[PDB]
């Protein structure tokens, strides 16, 4: 005997069957997902951080003017200045035109702070997704691992179980991301040797200790000002600093489908998409599903704040009355609005907060809490102004 089924891939909402096998005492099977880990394969492209300008001591020369070649230094520059500031040794000896040539030069190197303050630009692709399912068969509790890259057969309670491959493997991570501290961003970060001044990627290197530093800060050598010889130049404030102010909110809180982002190994947790098929040694006869959901009534929607076209810029609040504290499912029956989370715990208190998203100022959608519906009407403000860069 082999009975096949399929449970939802959502952490929380359980599967509860009432296995009444003709012999005696009836078993109460119950398996639910408790975790979901989708780790991508980060392929570090490069890292960027505040830069540091470096200008060595200048070469004071006479009319015996020199000409600077070109070395291999990040954004390296050099300019021979003909005819600069009246001062001299001996009694103005040079002579031969120009009066005084100046060999000014300066290049770039990543700030001494990169080590403990830099962002990373990885190229990630979903590598594997596994989930932990806790099955409570009668008087036995066991946790099984389920993947996408293959099924998994296990024997629990003297019964054979086979948790077929997860239907799909959805990822909230794009193919190009940027990891800063504990934050993760989905940015189409400029390629390696393609950074632009005053913008993310101002300077670029494979790693902090790397030796392939690339920069493009628009370092421009200026002509010396009479008085005390020094090296004047124009640049463009650390794009990295600029990015810090620009870069919006992280994925950490904009992840769809209730997906939760984490940073150390970098992964998406409890992402709610799909189903997990199972099968056992029992006739579809002994099987009988149980569906006991918290009955709720007097639903009421109330939108506090809401922002126009921005990943979940709205905030809905549902008031209600329940008969039993539990865990309900939330949905939107209007394509004009989308819900971030896909579930919410229902407490007898009567307060549920959800984040929604829409691109229509003044939208009118209908949210749902289990089997109850309610309308939401709100007026949203357009997205914040950007932070204009060096104009």
């Amino acid at each position: 005997y082999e009975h096949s089924t399929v449970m939802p891939n959502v952490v929380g909402f359980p599967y509860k069957a009432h296995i009444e096998r003709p012999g005696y005492s009836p078993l109460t099977l119950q398996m639910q997902v408790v975790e979901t880990s989708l780790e991508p394969t980060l392929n570090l492209e490069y890292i960027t951080c505040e830069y540091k300008t470096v200008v060595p001591s200048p070469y004071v020369k006479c009319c015996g003017a020199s000409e600077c070649s070109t070395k291999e230094k990040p954004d390296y520059q050099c300019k021979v200045y003909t005819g600069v500031y009246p001062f001299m040794w001996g009694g103005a000896y040079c002579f031969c035109d120009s009066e005084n040539t100046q060999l000014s030069e300066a290049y770039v190197d990543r700030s001494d702070v990169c080590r403990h303050d830099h962002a990373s630009a990885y190229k990630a692709h979903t590598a594997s997704l596994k989930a932990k399912v806790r099955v409570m068969y009668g008087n036995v509790n066991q946790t099984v691992d389920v993947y996408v890259n293959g099924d998994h057969a296990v024997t629990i309670g003297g019964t054979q179980f086979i948790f077929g491959p997860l239907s799909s493997a959805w990822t909230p991570f794009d193919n190009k991301i940027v990891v800063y501290k504990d934050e993760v961003f989905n940015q189409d970060f400029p390629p390696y040797g393609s950074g632009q001044p005053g913008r993310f990627g101002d300077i670029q290197s494979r790693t902090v200790e790397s030796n392939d530093l690339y920069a493009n800060t628009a370092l421009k050598l200026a002509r010396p000002s009479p008085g005390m010889v020094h090296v004047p130049y124009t640049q463009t404030p650390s794009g990295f600093k600029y990015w810090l102010k620009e870069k919006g909110t992280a994925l950490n809180t904009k992840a769809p489908f209730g997906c939760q982002i984490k940073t150390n190994p970098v992964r998406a947790m409890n992402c709610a998409v799909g189903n997990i098929p199972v099968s056992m040694n029992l006739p579809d006869s002994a099987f009988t599903r149980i569906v006991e959901a918290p009955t709720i009534i007097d639903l009421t929607c109330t939108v506090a704040t809401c922002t126009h076209s921005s990943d979940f810029g709205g905030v809905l609040t549902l008031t209600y009355k329940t008969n039993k504290n539990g865990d309900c499912s939330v949905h939107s029956h209007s394509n004009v609005a989308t819900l971030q989370e896909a579930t919410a715990k229902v407490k007898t208190a009567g307060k549920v907060t959800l984040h929604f998203s829409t691109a229509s100022a003044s939208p009118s959608f209908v949210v749902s809490l289990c089997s109850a519906r309610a309308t939401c009407s709100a007026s949203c403000e357009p997205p914040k102004d950007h932070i204009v860069p060096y104009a």
Copy 2:
């Protein structure tokens, strides 16, 4: 009793079971998908449109040397010259010993037409996918909603149904799109402050009414021409206009898997990918599936026009003979060619048009109509020439 099954996620091709429950009258269950809505979470990055050049009043100098600073306007440009020597003096105003001077300047602002003619660049990620399934149980017809972010239990006809989570949620939308009018494009549009002259994103601002206008039109101040003082300059014709001619065909007609694009709320409809699992209170004994497909013969393929390496640039036409007007499935058994639609209605007329795609000039694939096969042989022309920009 709980019997589990799974129907295809394609609008049209139905599921038909013959439930012969030993009791009396045999029931004829039939459930099929009728719609599919996958809405993404657009996160407006910026919008662009035809720009408008602006030139302030020219600083008609004379006996002075007014120098210019750096205003905060969009891509400000200021240059001061020493000419305009047609004459124009008089002496009573400028009895100077030195020659003339003139400070010309200009900046940019989005054309007065952006309001009702601009494109938008959103950053979208699949937010939710739901489908409408019409189940016709015996003498009862009911429509149920099914999602990915959770299952859904419903009671219909005194029988309990549970439409498990949709297998997967495929999206034809990339992570960076551009919405123009009723069209949608998959473009890796340049980032915010990174627009280039004569190219899409010439100018950029969060919103039309925004106040963070960014531009890079390569505005260059030219030296005045003797005669009537004015402000000469070089620029680069509105990249936006250029984009209009460049930007190929929209996704609206290149969407794979028969997916249909829509614009107001922005979503993909009837996308045909996946399956929808269900379960009821009935033994696998009373259940018996029915599969009555239109039998077709004398299949014949004929390729009219075909373009090389371009999203569905070919057009196949199948002639045939059917026994009953119905709805068949179309497939390609040769990796060298791919079919856009995944289904086609079979009329007794005998004419079916399909769009195919391949990257091989002179390909030889085998299309299929239900259970019938036929070969297709055609010779394709390479893709159209691009529209070279300001050379």
Copy 3:
């Protein structure tokens, strides 16, 4: 009667049921996947290759100076050089005791070698995914095709089979790729008219025989050097050549989930993600699944070489003892490490090599071979240094 099930979408690991239909001789059903083809819809954006500089013969002129307009040529340039009149050579060339003029010009065109040595930049999106399943019903062997864009009903052995739509359609290809020879890369290649000098896309054209050549090699006209008239200029070595050295490893060996890349028609094979649901005319009573996996013990992990943050830069080697040569499944129970392949053949020899990936120098994960586990401890070196471009 209709019994539903679901088998894993992995080429190799089979499905084996023991159909004991009360009548007589027991049938041994066994169906397993043998291939998987996911072809995308490449939409050729443009191709690039080594460029060729072109400077025609110069126009030796007198003080009767000419002025060069502007033609339509790739990166076309021209500059009228005043008093650059090389001066002297034989007879009389411009007696005007002032200055003559030099009309120098040069443009670009793709090297004569593009035809048989160029890369291609396509814009690809999953078009269709089909799999070949070999079902061995009793004393009959038949191969059925299964897709995502629809189900498929077939009759084999006098029994009706319906292979529902594949759960999902995962693709290792991004939305922007580059095909070179037999290699495929996932590169966010610069758009059409947006190429940069000394970088991939130096020059760009829809096709090799195209007539929309675009270039941006930073061609700069230099002033002639006294002696033998010629045309001096500065450029930037073929970005294409640079790309050749830069472009890391191809997808061909970094494809996740054991996916295998191919080049002629361009597709991903045996990608191991998902499940394939089936159903027949038999009670869940006659059905009984069989799971006979090779029992292995004395597992031992040994990491040879390992590279930091790079798509599968590590190499694990498992030693062991088996009871029967077979085919096991490999997994990682530590989010800090991911396995490339999702299966491995188990020979009595005792040697299994796997590629893993992690972003943590000095990681400690636990790999698995069927039902056996083992720890892996290794220390990895950071990613190679990039290849700094024209500094």
